[PDB]
Amino acid sequence: GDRLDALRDQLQRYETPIIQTILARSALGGRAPSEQDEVRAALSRNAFEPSEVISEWLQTESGARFRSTRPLPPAVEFITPVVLSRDTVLDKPVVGKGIFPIGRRPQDPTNMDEFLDTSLLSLNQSSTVDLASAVSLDVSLLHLVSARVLLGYPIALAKFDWLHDNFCHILTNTTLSKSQKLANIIQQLTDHKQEVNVLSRVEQKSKSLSHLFRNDIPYPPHTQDRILRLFQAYLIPITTQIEAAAILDHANKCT
Amino acid sequence: EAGDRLDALRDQLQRYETPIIQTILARSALGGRAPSEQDEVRAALSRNAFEPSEVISEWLQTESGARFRSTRPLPPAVEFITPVVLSRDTVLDKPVVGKGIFPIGRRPQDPTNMDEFLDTSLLSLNQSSTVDLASAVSLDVSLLHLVSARVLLGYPIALAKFDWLHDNFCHILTNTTLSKSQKLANIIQQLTDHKQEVNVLSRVEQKSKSLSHLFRNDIPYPPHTQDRILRLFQAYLIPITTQIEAAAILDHANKCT
Ligand SMILES: [Mn+2]
């Protein structure tokens, strides 16, 4: 239970660095020629392998869904299914529905890699942006999103040790398919009030960190919306799927 | 054309300011120092093959520009040492009667160059086994690229100033009684606008305070993080940029004919 608090603080810790790193890239300038290819090349020459515990997990059946094509870091290719409709209101109270619904609409790019790439492609091409600075910030961001969702794994273990019976009841239910177990584990793990607590704080960080000081160049259009979207459509739901996969991966604890 | 060229370069200069500040904050919010962080950073800089533009690469091989070449694999200008010009007790960020505010350049206790200033900042963190090494290293690398490209704008800025204020510069450069060292010093003084320095440093300081607030349950920044951000601009970015511009003006004295 203490282990879990400390993990929650570690998770929250990624918010500000992720927001500032996106804002740094957005303020720097437009997109460099071949930036995307240069990002892939940098990743390839500076590969940071995951911890032993995660590497092993990523070779299992359960874990392999979060292994990306080299040289991309873990989980940035993972595709959550569409769960919202096209016209879902994202950041405003809707009667009967609450606020900040999670997950992907049919128009949201498939995964974090495509999402981040789409944001870069939304910028004007620039011949004056420095390639090395731009690439290195893009790479930093890819590492930061991957490490954030990967916290889902030790978080899950600590949630398991804490609510052992709630999860074991599900994991030893022989009537349920693999599909229905996963889902019931996800619903145990889902706390929409905590989601709203994260997202409202992300929205408020994005606003106060994107402030413009006198004679600053404005950020590109939609920059704050896209930062909110990264958390609400990708970071939160991917992290939940990771947690549930970790719980399934440790069903032997119920015996 | 020249007035427009210079305005376009001045905007390009200002576009580094927020990115430098946000990158320092991102790294300082993220966590303490990983084992082997500093060795990881130098190794990553060895593995890339970015090269400066043709104009810069050529200027770095001249007598005038070769002072901004760093030891490999560091990017240009990050080892360059400006002279101590302030005194130990100089007050940095408040008005002082008869001395204004935000005096520029290094005191004797400041680190000699950007490389040492940023390494020393990193060594002030506690060691951490939970900080993500890849994210940490990548942000450290991003800041080193950023500060180097920022100061390297001094070179096209100076050529655009020269094409505008031709007579004031040539007046120094054709003075055959002046040594190289006096000329350089006169050119630096001609390029210096303290009023503009004060404008940038006031806004740097406001950014560093406004962008470093905390929300409930956030982990604090390390102590002196705002002071360090201001120090990077005041003692290094601004003076090194002026030195690069001066050397470029010197490098183009043929244009006085
Ligand atoms: Mn080397």
Short mmCIF file of N, CA, C and O in Angstrom, two decimals, chain A residues 9-10 12-21 23-30 38 42 45-48 128-133 135-140 143-145 147 197 200-201 204-205 208-211 213-219, chain B residues 11-12 14-20 22-23 25-32 40 43-50 130-135 137-142 145-147 149 203 206-207 210-213 215-221:
data_model
loop_
_atom_site.label_atom_id
_atom_site.label_comp_id
_atom_site.label_asym_id
_atom_site.label_seq_id
_atom_site.Cartn_x
_atom_site.Cartn_y
_atom_site.Cartn_z
N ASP A 9 3.14 8.86 -7.12
CA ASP A 9 3.99 10.01 -7.23
C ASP A 9 4.99 9.91 -8.41
O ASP A 9 5.22 11.00 -8.97
N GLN A 10 5.60 8.74 -8.63
CA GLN A 10 6.55 8.55 -9.73
C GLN A 10 5.79 8.76 -11.04
O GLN A 10 6.32 9.42 -11.95
N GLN A 12 2.99 10.53 -11.57
CA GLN A 12 2.64 11.88 -11.75
C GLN A 12 3.86 12.73 -12.16
O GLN A 12 3.75 13.77 -12.88
N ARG A 13 5.03 12.33 -11.67
CA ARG A 13 6.24 12.99 -12.01
C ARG A 13 6.55 13.17 -13.51
O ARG A 13 7.32 13.98 -13.91
N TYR A 14 6.02 12.32 -14.32
CA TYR A 14 6.28 12.38 -15.75
C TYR A 14 5.45 13.49 -16.39
O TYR A 14 5.80 13.89 -17.60
N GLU A 15 4.43 14.00 -15.70
CA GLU A 15 3.53 14.97 -16.40
C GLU A 15 4.31 16.22 -16.89
O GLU A 15 4.23 16.59 -18.12
N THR A 16 4.93 16.92 -15.97
CA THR A 16 5.58 18.16 -16.28
C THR A 16 6.72 17.97 -17.35
O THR A 16 6.76 18.71 -18.29
N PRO A 17 7.58 16.98 -17.23
CA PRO A 17 8.64 16.79 -18.22
C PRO A 17 8.01 16.51 -19.57
O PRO A 17 8.53 17.03 -20.56
N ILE A 18 6.93 15.72 -19.64
CA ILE A 18 6.34 15.44 -20.96
C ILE A 18 5.76 16.72 -21.60
O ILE A 18 6.08 17.06 -22.76
N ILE A 19 5.11 17.53 -20.80
CA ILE A 19 4.49 18.77 -21.26
C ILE A 19 5.54 19.77 -21.67
O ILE A 19 5.47 20.41 -22.76
N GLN A 20 6.54 19.95 -20.84
CA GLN A 20 7.61 20.92 -21.18
C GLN A 20 8.39 20.50 -22.42
O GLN A 20 8.83 21.33 -23.22
N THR A 21 8.63 19.20 -22.58
CA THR A 21 9.37 18.72 -23.75
C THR A 21 8.56 18.93 -25.03
O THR A 21 9.10 19.41 -26.05
N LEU A 23 6.28 21.33 -25.37
CA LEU A 23 6.27 22.73 -25.57
C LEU A 23 7.62 23.25 -26.10
O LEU A 23 7.68 24.13 -26.93
N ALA A 24 8.69 22.68 -25.66
CA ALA A 24 10.00 23.10 -26.15
C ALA A 24 10.09 22.85 -27.68
O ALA A 24 10.51 23.70 -28.42
N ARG A 25 9.73 21.63 -28.10
CA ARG A 25 9.74 21.34 -29.52
C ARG A 25 8.80 22.26 -30.30
O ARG A 25 9.18 22.79 -31.34
N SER A 26 7.62 22.51 -29.79
CA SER A 26 6.66 23.36 -30.49
C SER A 26 7.13 24.79 -30.60
O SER A 26 6.79 25.43 -31.56
N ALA A 27 7.79 25.33 -29.60
CA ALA A 27 8.26 26.69 -29.66
C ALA A 27 9.48 26.80 -30.54
O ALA A 27 9.79 27.86 -31.08
N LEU A 28 10.24 25.75 -30.66
CA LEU A 28 11.52 25.86 -31.40
C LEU A 28 11.38 26.28 -32.84
O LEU A 28 12.18 27.07 -33.32
N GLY A 29 10.35 25.74 -33.52
CA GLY A 29 10.17 26.06 -34.91
C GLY A 29 9.41 24.93 -35.64
O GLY A 29 8.91 23.99 -35.01
N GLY A 30 9.38 25.07 -36.97
CA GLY A 30 8.72 24.09 -37.85
C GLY A 30 9.44 22.77 -37.98
O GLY A 30 10.47 22.47 -37.30
N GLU A 38 15.44 11.00 -39.37
CA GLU A 38 16.55 11.34 -38.53
C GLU A 38 16.28 10.91 -37.09
O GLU A 38 17.16 10.46 -36.43
N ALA A 42 18.46 8.26 -35.03
CA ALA A 42 19.00 8.50 -33.72
C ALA A 42 18.63 7.39 -32.72
O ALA A 42 19.44 7.03 -31.90
N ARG A 45 20.87 4.41 -33.25
CA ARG A 45 22.24 4.57 -32.75
C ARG A 45 22.33 4.78 -31.27
O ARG A 45 23.36 4.74 -30.71
N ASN A 46 21.21 5.06 -30.64
CA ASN A 46 21.20 5.28 -29.19
C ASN A 46 20.12 4.46 -28.51
O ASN A 46 19.07 5.02 -27.97
N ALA A 47 20.22 3.16 -28.67
CA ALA A 47 19.17 2.27 -28.15
C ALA A 47 19.42 2.01 -26.68
O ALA A 47 20.51 1.55 -26.27
N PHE A 48 18.40 2.16 -25.91
CA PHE A 48 18.45 1.94 -24.44
C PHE A 48 17.51 0.77 -24.16
O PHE A 48 16.30 0.83 -24.43
N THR A 128 15.12 26.66 -41.36
CA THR A 128 15.96 27.32 -40.38
C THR A 128 16.02 26.56 -38.98
O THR A 128 16.80 27.00 -38.12
N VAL A 129 15.12 25.60 -38.71
CA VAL A 129 15.15 24.85 -37.47
C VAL A 129 16.41 24.01 -37.41
O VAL A 129 16.80 23.45 -38.42
N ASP A 130 17.07 23.93 -36.25
CA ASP A 130 18.27 23.20 -36.13
C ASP A 130 17.89 21.69 -35.99
O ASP A 130 17.21 21.28 -35.05
N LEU A 131 18.49 20.87 -36.84
CA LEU A 131 18.12 19.41 -36.93
C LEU A 131 18.46 18.69 -35.69
O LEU A 131 17.64 17.99 -35.18
N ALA A 132 19.64 18.88 -35.19
CA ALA A 132 20.11 18.16 -33.96
C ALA A 132 19.21 18.47 -32.74
O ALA A 132 18.85 17.58 -32.07
N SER A 133 18.80 19.70 -32.56
CA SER A 133 17.96 20.09 -31.43
C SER A 133 16.57 19.53 -31.56
O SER A 133 16.03 18.99 -30.61
N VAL A 135 15.53 16.90 -33.44
CA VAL A 135 15.56 15.46 -33.34
C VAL A 135 15.71 15.06 -31.92
O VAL A 135 15.07 14.11 -31.49
N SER A 136 16.67 15.68 -31.19
CA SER A 136 16.94 15.23 -29.80
C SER A 136 15.68 15.47 -28.89
O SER A 136 15.40 14.61 -28.07
N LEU A 137 14.92 16.57 -29.09
CA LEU A 137 13.74 16.75 -28.32
C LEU A 137 12.71 15.68 -28.69
O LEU A 137 11.90 15.25 -27.86
N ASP A 138 12.56 15.38 -29.98
CA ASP A 138 11.56 14.35 -30.45
C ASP A 138 11.94 13.01 -29.75
O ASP A 138 11.10 12.26 -29.32
N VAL A 139 13.22 12.66 -29.75
CA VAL A 139 13.65 11.43 -29.17
C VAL A 139 13.34 11.43 -27.66
O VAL A 139 12.93 10.40 -27.09
N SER A 140 13.64 12.53 -27.00
CA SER A 140 13.35 12.64 -25.57
C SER A 140 11.91 12.38 -25.26
O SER A 140 11.57 11.62 -24.35
N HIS A 143 10.99 8.60 -25.46
CA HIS A 143 11.45 7.93 -24.19
C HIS A 143 10.58 8.24 -23.03
O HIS A 143 10.24 7.32 -22.24
N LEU A 144 10.16 9.50 -22.92
CA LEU A 144 9.37 9.89 -21.80
C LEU A 144 7.97 9.19 -21.81
O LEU A 144 7.54 8.68 -20.75
N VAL A 145 7.28 9.12 -22.99
CA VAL A 145 5.99 8.46 -23.04
C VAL A 145 6.08 7.01 -22.79
O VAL A 145 5.20 6.41 -22.12
N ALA A 147 8.44 5.37 -20.86
CA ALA A 147 8.73 5.14 -19.48
C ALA A 147 7.45 5.43 -18.64
O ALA A 147 7.17 4.74 -17.65
N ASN A 197 -8.87 13.68 -12.13
CA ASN A 197 -7.83 14.39 -11.33
C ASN A 197 -6.53 14.62 -12.20
O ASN A 197 -6.04 15.71 -12.27
N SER A 200 -7.50 17.01 -15.50
CA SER A 200 -7.72 18.44 -15.15
C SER A 200 -6.33 19.09 -14.82
O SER A 200 -6.06 20.26 -15.18
N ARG A 201 -5.48 18.37 -14.12
CA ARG A 201 -4.14 18.89 -13.76
C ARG A 201 -3.27 19.03 -15.05
O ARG A 201 -2.68 20.08 -15.25
N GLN A 204 -4.45 22.06 -16.81
CA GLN A 204 -4.02 23.30 -16.13
C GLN A 204 -2.48 23.57 -16.24
O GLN A 204 -2.02 24.72 -16.50
N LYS A 205 -1.69 22.45 -16.23
CA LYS A 205 -0.27 22.57 -16.57
C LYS A 205 -0.05 23.10 -17.99
O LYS A 205 0.77 23.94 -18.19
N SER A 208 -0.78 26.83 -18.04
CA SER A 208 0.11 27.80 -17.40
C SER A 208 1.56 27.63 -18.04
O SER A 208 2.26 28.63 -18.17
N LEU A 209 1.93 26.45 -18.52
CA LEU A 209 3.25 26.32 -19.15
C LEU A 209 3.36 26.89 -20.57
O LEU A 209 4.47 27.16 -21.03
N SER A 210 2.22 27.04 -21.25
CA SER A 210 2.17 27.63 -22.57
C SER A 210 1.90 29.09 -22.62
O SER A 210 1.65 29.72 -23.71
N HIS A 211 2.02 29.73 -21.46
CA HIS A 211 1.81 31.13 -21.45
C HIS A 211 2.74 31.94 -22.28
O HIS A 211 3.94 31.68 -22.31
N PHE A 213 4.71 35.37 -22.89
CA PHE A 213 5.26 36.49 -22.26
C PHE A 213 5.36 37.51 -23.33
O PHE A 213 5.24 37.25 -24.53
N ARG A 214 5.68 38.67 -22.90
CA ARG A 214 5.57 39.79 -23.84
C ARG A 214 6.52 39.61 -24.99
O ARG A 214 7.63 39.22 -24.77
N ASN A 215 6.01 39.90 -26.18
CA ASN A 215 6.54 39.57 -27.49
C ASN A 215 7.07 38.14 -27.80
O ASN A 215 7.87 37.92 -28.75
N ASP A 216 6.59 37.15 -27.03
CA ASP A 216 6.77 35.78 -27.46
C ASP A 216 6.06 35.46 -28.82
O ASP A 216 4.96 35.83 -29.08
N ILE A 217 6.69 34.61 -29.62
CA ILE A 217 5.97 33.94 -30.77
C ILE A 217 4.91 32.93 -30.24
O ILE A 217 5.17 32.11 -29.42
N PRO A 218 3.69 33.07 -30.67
CA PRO A 218 2.63 32.12 -30.24
C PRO A 218 2.99 30.63 -30.56
O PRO A 218 3.71 30.35 -31.52
N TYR A 219 2.40 29.71 -29.84
CA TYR A 219 2.57 28.30 -30.18
C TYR A 219 1.70 27.97 -31.42
O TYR A 219 0.75 28.68 -31.66
N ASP B 11 14.48 37.05 -34.65
CA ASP B 11 13.44 36.12 -34.25
C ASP B 11 13.95 34.68 -34.05
O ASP B 11 13.48 33.97 -33.19
N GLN B 12 14.78 34.20 -34.97
CA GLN B 12 15.38 32.91 -34.86
C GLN B 12 16.18 32.78 -33.52
O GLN B 12 16.19 31.70 -32.97
N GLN B 14 15.50 34.44 -30.69
CA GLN B 14 14.49 34.42 -29.63
C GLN B 14 13.76 33.10 -29.62
O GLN B 14 13.31 32.65 -28.62
N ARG B 15 13.64 32.42 -30.72
CA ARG B 15 12.97 31.18 -30.65
C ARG B 15 13.76 30.13 -29.82
O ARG B 15 13.22 29.12 -29.57
N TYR B 16 15.05 30.33 -29.53
CA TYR B 16 15.75 29.38 -28.60
C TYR B 16 15.41 29.59 -27.17
O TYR B 16 15.68 28.75 -26.40
N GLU B 17 14.79 30.70 -26.80
CA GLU B 17 14.75 31.03 -25.38
C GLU B 17 13.79 30.09 -24.59
O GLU B 17 14.22 29.52 -23.58
N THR B 18 12.52 30.03 -25.00
CA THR B 18 11.60 29.12 -24.39
C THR B 18 12.05 27.66 -24.42
O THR B 18 12.02 26.97 -23.37
N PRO B 19 12.51 27.17 -25.57
CA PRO B 19 13.03 25.75 -25.68
C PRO B 19 14.18 25.50 -24.71
O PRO B 19 14.18 24.44 -24.03
N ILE B 20 15.12 26.43 -24.55
CA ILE B 20 16.20 26.20 -23.57
C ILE B 20 15.64 26.12 -22.16
O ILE B 20 15.93 25.14 -21.42
N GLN B 22 12.46 25.52 -21.03
CA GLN B 22 11.59 24.31 -20.87
C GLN B 22 12.42 22.99 -20.83
O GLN B 22 12.03 22.05 -20.09
N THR B 23 13.55 22.96 -21.53
CA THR B 23 14.32 21.69 -21.59
C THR B 23 15.02 21.57 -20.26
O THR B 23 15.12 20.50 -19.68
N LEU B 25 14.03 22.77 -17.47
CA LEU B 25 13.02 22.47 -16.46
C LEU B 25 12.57 20.99 -16.57
O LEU B 25 12.29 20.38 -15.54
N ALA B 26 12.44 20.46 -17.78
CA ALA B 26 11.96 19.14 -17.98
C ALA B 26 12.97 18.19 -17.29
O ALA B 26 12.60 17.28 -16.52
N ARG B 27 14.24 18.44 -17.56
CA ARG B 27 15.27 17.55 -16.97
C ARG B 27 15.24 17.70 -15.44
O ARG B 27 15.38 16.71 -14.72
N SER B 28 15.10 18.93 -14.92
CA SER B 28 15.16 19.14 -13.48
C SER B 28 13.88 18.60 -12.79
O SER B 28 13.91 18.10 -11.63
N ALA B 29 12.76 18.70 -13.47
CA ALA B 29 11.52 18.04 -12.90
C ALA B 29 11.54 16.49 -12.92
O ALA B 29 10.82 15.86 -12.13
N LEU B 30 12.24 15.92 -13.86
CA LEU B 30 12.22 14.45 -14.12
C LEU B 30 12.78 13.57 -12.96
O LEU B 30 12.11 12.69 -12.57
N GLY B 31 13.88 13.97 -12.35
CA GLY B 31 14.49 13.13 -11.31
C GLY B 31 15.93 13.51 -11.10
O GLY B 31 16.44 14.44 -11.73
N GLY B 32 16.60 12.75 -10.24
CA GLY B 32 18.02 12.96 -9.94
C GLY B 32 18.89 12.36 -11.09
O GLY B 32 18.38 12.22 -12.26
N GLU B 40 27.35 8.55 -20.48
CA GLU B 40 26.33 8.28 -21.50
C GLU B 40 26.09 9.40 -22.39
O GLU B 40 25.97 9.23 -23.64
N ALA B 43 29.16 9.67 -24.76
CA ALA B 43 29.10 8.58 -25.77
C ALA B 43 28.02 8.88 -26.82
O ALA B 43 28.25 8.69 -28.04
N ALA B 44 26.81 9.32 -26.42
CA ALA B 44 25.78 9.60 -27.42
C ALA B 44 26.26 10.67 -28.40
O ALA B 44 26.06 10.57 -29.64
N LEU B 45 27.03 11.65 -27.92
CA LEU B 45 27.44 12.76 -28.82
C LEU B 45 28.48 12.15 -29.84
O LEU B 45 28.52 12.59 -30.94
N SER B 46 29.23 11.11 -29.43
CA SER B 46 30.15 10.43 -30.36
C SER B 46 29.52 9.66 -31.45
O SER B 46 30.14 9.45 -32.49
N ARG B 47 28.28 9.26 -31.26
CA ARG B 47 27.65 8.34 -32.19
C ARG B 47 26.88 9.22 -33.24
O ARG B 47 26.19 8.74 -34.08
N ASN B 48 26.89 10.51 -33.19
CA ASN B 48 25.99 11.08 -34.22
C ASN B 48 26.96 11.55 -35.33
O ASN B 48 28.21 11.40 -35.31
N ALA B 49 26.45 11.95 -36.41
CA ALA B 49 27.23 12.56 -37.39
C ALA B 49 26.68 13.89 -37.93
O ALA B 49 26.84 14.17 -39.11
N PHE B 50 26.12 14.67 -37.07
CA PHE B 50 25.64 15.97 -37.48
C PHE B 50 26.89 16.79 -37.73
O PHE B 50 27.93 16.68 -37.01
N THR B 130 16.01 5.37 -9.92
CA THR B 130 14.73 5.26 -10.53
C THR B 130 14.53 6.22 -11.77
O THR B 130 13.52 6.11 -12.36
N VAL B 131 15.33 7.23 -11.98
CA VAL B 131 15.25 8.09 -13.10
C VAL B 131 15.51 7.25 -14.40
O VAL B 131 16.41 6.42 -14.44
N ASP B 132 14.71 7.49 -15.43
CA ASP B 132 14.87 6.81 -16.70
C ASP B 132 16.10 7.32 -17.44
O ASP B 132 16.13 8.52 -17.83
N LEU B 133 17.09 6.46 -17.64
CA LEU B 133 18.43 6.86 -18.21
C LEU B 133 18.20 7.40 -19.64
O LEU B 133 18.71 8.45 -19.99
N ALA B 134 17.40 6.73 -20.44
CA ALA B 134 17.22 7.19 -21.82
C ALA B 134 16.65 8.59 -21.88
O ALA B 134 17.05 9.41 -22.70
N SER B 135 15.64 8.86 -21.09
CA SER B 135 15.02 10.23 -21.07
C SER B 135 15.93 11.24 -20.54
O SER B 135 16.04 12.40 -21.08
N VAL B 137 19.38 11.20 -20.41
CA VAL B 137 20.46 11.44 -21.37
C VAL B 137 19.92 12.26 -22.54
O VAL B 137 20.60 13.14 -23.05
N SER B 138 18.75 11.86 -23.09
CA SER B 138 18.22 12.55 -24.32
C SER B 138 17.93 14.03 -24.05
O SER B 138 18.16 14.90 -24.92
N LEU B 139 17.44 14.36 -22.89
CA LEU B 139 17.21 15.75 -22.57
C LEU B 139 18.52 16.47 -22.35
O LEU B 139 18.62 17.68 -22.74
N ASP B 140 19.47 15.84 -21.73
CA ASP B 140 20.79 16.48 -21.61
C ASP B 140 21.43 16.75 -22.95
O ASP B 140 21.93 17.86 -23.18
N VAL B 141 21.37 15.79 -23.87
CA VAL B 141 21.84 16.00 -25.22
C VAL B 141 21.09 17.11 -25.93
O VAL B 141 21.73 17.98 -26.66
N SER B 142 19.78 17.17 -25.73
CA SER B 142 18.97 18.20 -26.41
C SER B 142 19.46 19.53 -25.94
O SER B 142 19.66 20.46 -26.75
N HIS B 145 22.74 20.64 -27.68
CA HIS B 145 22.53 21.08 -29.06
C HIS B 145 21.91 22.40 -29.11
O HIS B 145 22.26 23.27 -29.93
N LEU B 146 21.04 22.68 -28.18
CA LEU B 146 20.27 23.90 -28.23
C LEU B 146 21.20 25.08 -27.91
O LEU B 146 21.06 26.10 -28.55
N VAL B 147 22.03 25.02 -26.85
CA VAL B 147 22.80 26.15 -26.47
C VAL B 147 23.87 26.42 -27.55
O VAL B 147 24.23 27.53 -27.82
N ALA B 149 23.54 25.80 -30.91
CA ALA B 149 22.95 26.43 -32.10
C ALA B 149 22.53 27.83 -31.77
O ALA B 149 22.59 28.68 -32.61
N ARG B 203 12.88 39.06 -19.11
CA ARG B 203 11.87 38.05 -19.55
C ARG B 203 12.37 36.60 -19.18
O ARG B 203 11.58 35.75 -18.78
N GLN B 206 11.48 36.17 -15.56
CA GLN B 206 10.04 35.92 -15.42
C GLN B 206 9.60 34.50 -15.89
O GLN B 206 8.86 33.81 -15.20
N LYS B 207 10.14 34.07 -17.02
CA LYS B 207 9.88 32.66 -17.48
C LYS B 207 10.31 31.67 -16.56
O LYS B 207 9.60 30.69 -16.22
N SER B 210 7.67 31.72 -13.66
CA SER B 210 6.33 31.31 -14.07
C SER B 210 6.24 29.87 -14.53
O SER B 210 5.22 29.32 -14.34
N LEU B 211 7.26 29.34 -15.19
CA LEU B 211 7.20 28.00 -15.73
C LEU B 211 7.61 26.97 -14.70
O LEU B 211 7.59 25.75 -14.98
N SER B 212 8.03 27.40 -13.51
CA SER B 212 8.47 26.45 -12.48
C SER B 212 7.65 26.28 -11.31
O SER B 212 8.12 25.82 -10.21
N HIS B 213 6.40 26.63 -11.42
CA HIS B 213 5.46 26.38 -10.34
C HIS B 213 5.09 24.95 -10.25
O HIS B 213 5.25 24.20 -11.16
N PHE B 215 2.17 22.04 -8.69
CA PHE B 215 0.81 21.71 -8.44
C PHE B 215 0.90 20.80 -7.26
O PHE B 215 1.94 20.19 -6.92
N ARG B 216 -0.23 20.61 -6.68
CA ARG B 216 -0.28 19.73 -5.55
C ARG B 216 0.23 18.30 -5.77
O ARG B 216 -0.12 17.61 -6.73
N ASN B 217 1.05 17.80 -4.81
CA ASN B 217 1.82 16.61 -4.92
C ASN B 217 2.95 16.49 -6.01
O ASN B 217 3.52 15.38 -6.16
N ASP B 218 3.25 17.59 -6.71
CA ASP B 218 4.37 17.62 -7.57
C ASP B 218 5.63 17.49 -6.72
O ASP B 218 5.70 17.98 -5.66
N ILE B 219 6.64 16.90 -7.30
CA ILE B 219 7.95 16.91 -6.69
C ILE B 219 8.73 18.21 -6.95
O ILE B 219 8.75 18.70 -8.04
N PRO B 220 9.34 18.79 -5.91
CA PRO B 220 9.91 20.06 -6.10
C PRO B 220 11.07 20.05 -7.10
O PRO B 220 11.76 19.03 -7.22
N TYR B 221 11.34 21.17 -7.69
CA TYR B 221 12.58 21.31 -8.45
C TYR B 221 13.81 21.30 -7.49
O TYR B 221 13.69 21.72 -6.41
#
